[PDB]
Amino acid sequence: ATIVALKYPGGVVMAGDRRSTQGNMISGRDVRKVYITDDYTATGIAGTAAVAVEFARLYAVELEHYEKLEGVPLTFAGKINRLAIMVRGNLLALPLLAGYDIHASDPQSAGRIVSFDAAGGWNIEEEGYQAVGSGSLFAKSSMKKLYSQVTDGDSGLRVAVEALYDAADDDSATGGPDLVRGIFPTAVIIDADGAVDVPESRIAELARAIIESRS
Amino acid sequence: ATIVALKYPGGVVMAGDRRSTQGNMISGRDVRKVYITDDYTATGIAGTAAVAVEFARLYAVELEHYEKLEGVPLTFAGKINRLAIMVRGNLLALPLLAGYDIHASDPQSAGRIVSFDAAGGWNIEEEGYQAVGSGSLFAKSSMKKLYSQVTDGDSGLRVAVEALYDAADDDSATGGPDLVRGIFPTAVIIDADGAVDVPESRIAELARAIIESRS
Amino acid sequence: ATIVALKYPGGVVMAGDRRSTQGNMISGRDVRKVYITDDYTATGIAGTAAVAVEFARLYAVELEHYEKLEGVPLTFAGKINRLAIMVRGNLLALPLLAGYDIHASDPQSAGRIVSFDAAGGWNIEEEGYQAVGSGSLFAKSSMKKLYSQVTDGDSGLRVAVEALYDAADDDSATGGPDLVRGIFPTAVIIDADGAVDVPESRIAELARAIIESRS
Amino acid sequence: ATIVALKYPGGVVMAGDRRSTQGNMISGRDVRKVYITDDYTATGIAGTAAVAVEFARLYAVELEHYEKLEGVPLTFAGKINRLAIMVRGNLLALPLLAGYDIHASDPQSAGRIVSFDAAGGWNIEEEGYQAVGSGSLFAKSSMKKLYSQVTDGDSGLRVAVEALYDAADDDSATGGPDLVRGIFPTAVIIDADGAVDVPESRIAELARAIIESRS
Amino acid sequence: ATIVALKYPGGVVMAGDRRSTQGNMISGRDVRKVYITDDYTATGIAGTAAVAVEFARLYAVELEHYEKLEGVPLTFAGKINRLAIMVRGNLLALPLLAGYDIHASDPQSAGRIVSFDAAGGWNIEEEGYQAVGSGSLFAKSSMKKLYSQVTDGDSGLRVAVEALYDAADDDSATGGPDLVRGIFPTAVIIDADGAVDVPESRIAELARAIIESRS
Amino acid sequence: ATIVALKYPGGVVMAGDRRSTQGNMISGRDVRKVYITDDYTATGIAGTAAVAVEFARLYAVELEHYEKLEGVPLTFAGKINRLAIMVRGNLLALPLLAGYDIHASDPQSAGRIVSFDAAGGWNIEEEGYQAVGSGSLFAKSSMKKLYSQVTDGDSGLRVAVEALYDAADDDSATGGPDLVRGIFPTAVIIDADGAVDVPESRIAELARAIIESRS
Amino acid sequence: ATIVALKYPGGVVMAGDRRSTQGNMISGRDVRKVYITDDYTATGIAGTAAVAVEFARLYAVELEHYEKLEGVPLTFAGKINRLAIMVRGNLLALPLLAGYDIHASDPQSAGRIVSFDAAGGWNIEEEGYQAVGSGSLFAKSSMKKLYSQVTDGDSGLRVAVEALYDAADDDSATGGPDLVRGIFPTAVIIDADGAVDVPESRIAELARAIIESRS
Amino acid sequence: ATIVALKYPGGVVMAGDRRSTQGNMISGRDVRKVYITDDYTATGIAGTAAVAVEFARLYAVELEHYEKLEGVPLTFAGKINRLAIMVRGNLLALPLLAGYDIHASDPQSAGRIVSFDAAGGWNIEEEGYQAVGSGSLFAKSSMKKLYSQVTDGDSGLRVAVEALYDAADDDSATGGPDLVRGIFPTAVIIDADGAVDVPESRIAELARAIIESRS
Amino acid sequence: ATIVALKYPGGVVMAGDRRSTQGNMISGRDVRKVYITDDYTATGIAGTAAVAVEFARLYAVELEHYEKLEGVPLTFAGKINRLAIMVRGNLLALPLLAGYDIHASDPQSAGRIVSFDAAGGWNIEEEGYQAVGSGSLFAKSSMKKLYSQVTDGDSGLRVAVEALYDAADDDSATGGPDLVRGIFPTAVIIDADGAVDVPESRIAELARAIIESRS
């Protein structure tokens, strides 16, 4: 499994693969690993569907509990602090966080990426892209060369899909586009208007274009 | 990796995949695992290309040494005896042997399949098909249902390619047809006229037909 | 032991074998491993009769306690949540859940199958069939080829019995139809009218027909 | 696997099952475990076909080497001595030996059964029957009650087949009569005229009669 | 030690041996291992006299406590549930339970046998006989052949004594009839009129008849 | 197993039991553990029949080789020296040696008993009796009280049989007189005229008399 | 150390040795190991004086506490139950209990002997004698032959002293009569009139007579 | 350390870094890891200078010994066979081989790359580029995107230097261009005219251009 | 076991006990542990009779071999050198050596005692007495007080017997005078006329006198 997040002017994009395996045997085919936990925040865990969905549900419940109790949503700094408490208490796969900062001075530079290390410490990415999972190295090396082509949301989505394809090309634990069954990776786009899921047809067309170009 | 061999009236077919990995990382893309070691005998080892090619070279050298020394090729019973000595001396992956018995009373029932267990003991298959490797179980379960359709060499080749596809569908260590790079599994057909390699275009067309049917 | 569940238009079917062993010695001959725990829900545990019956009794008591306390039966989403709490608390063999969703928009697509992994996480099957136990791989590989013939309840029952037969054919820990003692596998069918046990004579006739066809 | 040998007036009978497994998975279906190594001697090893056939071949070669060198066949006492040397050198499964003593004073009491323990020591049976393998206990307990019915070769063969059936009934590693595939146990009868293999039709009829009686 | 229980029309019988040893040395000669814990229920533990008598005393105290508190004896289903709680709490040798169901629809089919596995799970026997202990296998194999002769209480008692004799014949940890000291196995018969101990003279005569027949 | 040897005026007697077991299961019923290896010497090994018979054969071959080479039998001191070399080379059960010294000054005090310890050192008994095996302690304690009644060969034989009975009474690994099958212990008597085997009828009558007296 | 207790008509006797050692070095010379804990009950522990005296003191305090609280002495069945609770709580050497049952129907058969195994379970002796300690086997084997001579208290005392002498003769950890220092074993006799200590002169005379007879 | 080799039309290029470390401490600054061992063959070992230089010297001595003995240089197939013998004998770091095949039918497709796995098996690269060492993954991922720009020797050299820079950017064990000390990576170019070392000024200019472009 | 040697004017005396045990059980009663290996030399090993007698035989054979080869007996210095070679080669119990030096300048000071440590090094005693074995400490402490009374051979013998008695009084592994069986310790006296064994009656009288004095 591999989850990739990269920043573009005016927002941030997130995507993940759809494969879960027990060693050398394929366990699932349409595993969803990216979820929307808030109006301006999405999370992703590289692992089984159950762990990721439980983590997303717990984070959403915590955020909504604070929101209902105090009547105001938490600041982005406070959102990261609560997430790290949950990660430390659990310990395991580590989560990836991407969101939008609506209180930032510059709207064009408001997208954020947060990563947690093995020890549970959180770091804020400054290179504009981050990948986690087994194929994280290949995806990051691909984004290193492909990040110069990102200028808007569509370019960022294309680059993320290409990074996922490159990661799946070199890792057997990551699944590539399934053009026989029709199962493509899921993506989430967060901007000033909020976090929205990308429709499967645009994902499908981008994957088909990348596959045709690679031939 | 998975190597499948099945018997058809008047001969026998053998095929193998083209993937080698170090755990979760793909190492090779066009690995050849089936070789022709005699005029009426082919062998296959599920593993790296180097081990398989060295084993095939050693077996061919031994057979040719006996042939040149005594002026007559060994009997099929004597060929199996020498192979088991080589397997026992080495110990590891285990080989698969398929050949044609030209001294058999019935030419239509002359194809043979030989398998070696972990302890090194050899067994002669009587069910008409055999598969070895990590995806051997899935391939054998597929041939269990698909063996009723085998009536000639082409039907056997189609069934073998379908078995390889089914094995690759459930195992991440076995590679399926590569329709982007153009790398398809290798096959060997042995009949009364001798062992011959199958051209890559017929392999390609059968793989394409199977993929289209599966969609 | 092997428990197989597959979906058909308008419902879902579940079946299991009748063998329990201590290693290489047969312990029981008429072990029941599928139980009805609710009007629209059945469960199955691959193991001894005592563990399965205790699990079914506990689940039924929990469901009935909530039903009597709140006056309304739990939703299907809430039923899975309570079951996962019980599985996590115990840890062991893992359960298989099949039920009918009466609140679904499409009645023809209301059957559900739920599986729990080793870590205790629950997953909802989307491929239409699922098998658990020691012979799960063979049963799943058989259903992979036989699922195209399922169009109603009787077809699904035939396919499930054939899958159980194929699983018992390759595994020594799973028992096949006993035509001398008269012990055949047990099956449960859940539809819009509720969960009902299948009579032993229809099971017997289907097993006899399959055995005759295999000869 | 289980090999049973019992004495009848004027000879001795030997039989074995046709199942080989790797733990809980069935490996073979028509494994032969009883072989004729001399004109008045047969042997049987509970295990894989390769080990048993190699042991029989080695024993036959040794016996024939002595026979050709000295011009006279070895005495029965000398045959056991050479066999124990081979067993000790190897060490593992242990062999079972049955033969006819043509130099005995009483022709009716000439059948012999020899067993080797774990330490490699040989013992001559005096209770008239002996069983080795995983299901040896059940077979011996069955022969304990069924030995009173043995009065000739046919009665002994029936009792041996019934003992094999009883052993397979309680052990999952021993295979019973296959009335679908048509694979029945192999038997060898040794008398004053020499050791002969029993035809498969008489085996089949006895198995069918026993199965019908058990119903 | 070995405890055997078998069902006959209108009741059930239970018997056990009278030997306790510390490895290869005999410790006791007249150990009693079967006790009456209720008007329609008896239990037996294969082990030392102290453990069995303490278990029987505890079970009787629990049953009588419930009987005095609620004024009505427990149902047979409730009696098994309380016994399993005691077995689980202790963990060891495992108990054997035999009793009469006075609320059953058919009086002739009211005898019950309950067995507990190593994990502590309880199972209800359906084959009509059950044996526990070190010589359980031999006793069960003997009852397999001798169960066709059971038609009343006396026939069942004879078959149970013969099973105990056969178990003691092959196991050194089980004691046979002592015709020098005069110590014979103890038996308990439960019918519609209640559980009663069998007098030692009928046990003695049956043992003497069996010994004479075996000579 | 237990082997007992005691001295009487003018000779020495030796006897052993007829039981061999693998732990708690009886392996043999008529095991012979005492053999005659010379005209004035017998040996006995507590263990399986194969080890004892091989040891006796080797000792006899060594003695006969020296006798044929030098033309004169070895002295009793030289016989013990060669036996200790064989015991040390092997290392295991330890042997017991009893013989007659024809060169002794006093014919009435010529019987000898030799015992080997765990370290392999040999000792000459001076208390007049010695027992080896698992039940050696009970047999020796019985002979301690019963040695005052030995005045000739028949008295010594009776005392030896009684010692064997007492040893079997307290040890489960030693077999007592079998009055159903008719298997009684074997005995050897060595005097000035040589070593002779005792007929089974005198053994049988002495065992029957002892059993009757014990009742 | 060895403690021996045997029953005679109308009572019971108990005796023990006077040696305590730390391995191969003698620690004490006049250790007392038998104590009177009640009017009709005595106990003995094979070990150091401190442990035995503390155990006797605790048992006496418990018995007297119940006697003073309820005004009536405990029944013999209740006395054993309290003792087993003390033994189980401690866990070690195991105690030996001998007493008189004044409520028994037959006064001549009122003596009782109770033994505790390693697991802490109590057993009531029925063979009339029991010995515990390191030399228990020799003492029991001696009493086996010497029990036929017991007809009154004096005969039982003589037999007990002889058993102690025989146990000390074969065990280095048990001390025999000291005719230089004047230290002889201690004995306790319990009858209908109560438990009384035997004077040292009668012990001394019996030991001297036994020693003279043995010479 | 990282060694990269890639093929261009009419030849092949090889390059390596100049860093050797003991864990986290830098050991060397100008380590040479690529050597010319023949007129048409160069080798490279990722490790210390001593091991690489000894390996190159041994390979050159072996090749020259065969050349002088037989008067003709070895074929490319024979050169690989001798190298694998040396690798197997040593076992450790694994070598990388690049050379020119002058007997190939197509001069433009004559460059060869050979890699040895951990087990010592040799493989011939078909993807046109190969990298070994600690930073091999990053270098290979960089060449994956940069291989489309290779059309001649200079383009291949630029791509190799860029791959080395990318590998050093992500790995702390690989050294990048030293613009203060003046130490740049070493490169070897093999073509139809033979293997030649690249001058340090062209390496320096390419490194400077890449660094300027990256800024 | 304990062996004591002490010097008196004009010679030296040596004595040892007659007990051999396996832990807490007595093995022998008349074990001899002191032997005469030369005309002026005796040795003693604390252990089993077999080891001591074999050591004495080997030493005597070596001494006699040198004596016959060279025609002159070895010097006392050369005798110790050969003994140490034998001790070192064996490695275990350690020997004690006592002898007479006939070439000494002072005949009254010619007795010698040699001791070997655990490492095998030999030392010559200068305190006039030495004891080895388990009870060596007690014997040495007794001789420390009793050495002032030694003035001739008889006084030394009395002191040695008293030391043995004191050693046996405190150690359970050493046997004291047996006044019932008549087994007393063995002693050897070496003087100018040679080494001679002490008759058993003088040993007996000295032991009786010591025992009477101790009372």
Author numbering:
A (entry chain W), B (entry chain V), C (entry chain X), D (entry chain U), E (entry chain Y), F (entry chain T), ...: 1 to 91, 99 to 222
Q: What does the literature reporting this entry say, word for word?
A:
The Mycobacterium tuberculosis (Mtb) proteasome system selectively degrades damaged or misfolded proteins and is crucial for the pathogen’s survival within the host. Mtb 20S core particle features homoheptameric rings in a conserved α7-β7-β7-α7 configuration. These rings assemble to form three interconnected compartments: two antechambers formed by α7-β7 and a central degradation chamber. Stacked β-rings enclose the degradation chamber where active sites containing the catalytic triad of βT1, βD17, and βK33 proteolyze substrates.
Here we determine near-atomic resolution cryo-EM structures of Mtb 20S CP, revealing an auto-inhibited state, 20Sauto-inhibited, that interconverts with the canonical resting state, 20Sresting. These structures mainly differ in the conformation of a pair of β-subunit helices at α-β interface, which we have named switch helices I and II, following the convention established by Losick and coworkers. We subsequently fit our molecular models to the first and last intermediate reconstructed maps and achieved excellent refinement statistics. Frames 1 and 20 represent the most distinct states in the continuum. The initial frame closely resembles our modelled inactive consensus structure of 20SβT1A (RMSD 0.44 Å), featuring additional conformational changes in switch helix II. The S1 pocket and the conformation of the catalytic residues are unchanged. This represents an observation of an auto-inhibited conformation of the switch helices in Mtb 20S CP, which we will refer to as 20Sauto-inhibited. Additionally, we explored the C terminus of switch helix II, which shows unwinding in 20Sauto-inhibited. The preceding residues are disordered in the 20Sauto-inhibited state. Molecules that selectively bind to and stabilize the 20Sauto-inhibited of the proteasome established in this study, rather than the well-known canonical resting state (20Sresting) could be critical to future inhibitor development efforts that focus on allosteric rather than orthosteric sites of Mtb 20S CP.
